[PDB]
């Protein structure tokens, strides 16, 4: 029949890297490949949720425009480094991590105190450096879940609490391609391959499912009309 459309399914998921994946949808009718791909790319780049650092406290600092003795980086550079920290929170929408370090050497994400509900996906992420043997740093890092970009200006606090702009989007880039699919006995079906590059804090399949759910929930308003 001409009023019945073959519907796609998730066929292949390839993990090229921990932050790089490919997802295969097959089969698709004529013209549906690009139609689904563009919408999925927009939704994935716009509406994915994630966890981000929002507030920082350091014992010896009062504001972001100062320096700490024994630390080679300024407080602003430390905050910028912390902005790029990738954390997967699995039990709550808000958590506080503690970092304690002392001695000469790099202070990275692996020095953060272990928590049951918090996973660090990149332990090698360098946070700062200690250049003095009798130098120690202790900080408290507030991480919470959201979506999109929230500058600290848009959102009284005691002196010493530093705000950082939140970028909750885990997706770095999205690409898609449409190829000719090889179904049993037809040559008019396509296959959609979505290449996804993220920060390693979200599963590609659940991201695709969440994007599809968002699209369906937004589209259900046009069904009744």
């Amino acid at each position: 029949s001409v009023t019945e459309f073959l519907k796609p399914r998730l066929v292949d998921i390839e993990q090229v890297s921990s932050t790089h994946a490919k997802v295969t949808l097959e089969p698709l009718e004529r013209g549906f490949g690009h139609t689904l791909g563009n919408a999925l790319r927009r939704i994935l780049l716009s509406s994915m949720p994630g966890c981000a650092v929002t507030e920082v406290e350091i014992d010896g600092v009062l504001h972001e425009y100062s320096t700490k003795e024994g630390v080679q980086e300024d407080i602003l550079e430390i905050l910028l480094n912390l902005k790029g920290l990738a954390v997967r929170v699995q039990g709550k929408d808000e958590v506080i991590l503690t970092l304690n370090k002392s001695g000469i050497g790099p202070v990275t994400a692996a020095d953060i105190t272990h928590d049951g509900d918090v996973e660090i996906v990149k332990p090698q992420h360098v946070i700062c450096h200690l250049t003095d043997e009798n130098a120690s740093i202790s900080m408290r890092i507030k991480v919470q879940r959201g979506r999109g970009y929230v500058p600290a200006s848009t959102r009284e606090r005691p002196i010493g609490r530093l705000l950082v702009d939140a970028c909750y989007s885990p997706v770095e880039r999205i690409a898609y391609n449409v190829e000719a699919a090889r179904v049993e006995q037809r040559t008019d079906l396509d296959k959609l391959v979505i290449e996804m590059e993220t920060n390693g804090t979200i599963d590609p399949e659940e991201a695709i499912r969440r994007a599809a759910t968002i699209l369906a929930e937004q589209l259900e308003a046009f069904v009744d009309l």
């Binding site: 009062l62 504001h63 010493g160």
Partner: protein, 100 residues
């Protein structure tokens, strides 16, 4: 008499003096906006005659509120930022405060 930099501004409330230290100067690292007090200063007004109304006011609200004006430094409207540095210059022979 001389003008004094001090924390005792009688007319303003308790909250408006929350970001000033014991010497009447804003803390380092405070977030300020338009209208916030940075340095608290009082200008003396002097009259040696006390009318009965002035005596009643002094008795009820204290003598510090009287014979004193307000000339504190405030952030201009439309100006915001973080206090990162404070410098105090004092004339020779004058007593230095805690901040200096």
């Amino acid at each position: 008499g001389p003008e004094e930099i001090t924390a005792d501004i009688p007319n303003v409330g308790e909250a408006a003096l929350s970001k000033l230290d014991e010497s009447g100067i804003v803390y380092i690292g405070a977030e300020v906006t338009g209208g916030d007090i940075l340095v608290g200063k009082v200008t003396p007004k002097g009259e040696t005659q006390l009318t009965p109304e002035e005596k009643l006011l002094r008795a009820i609200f204290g003598e510090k509120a009287s014979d004193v004006k307000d000339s504190s430094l405030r952030v201009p409207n439309g100006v915001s930022g973080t206090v990162i540095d404070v410098q105090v210059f004092t004339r020779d022979g004058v007593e230095k405060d805690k901040r200096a």
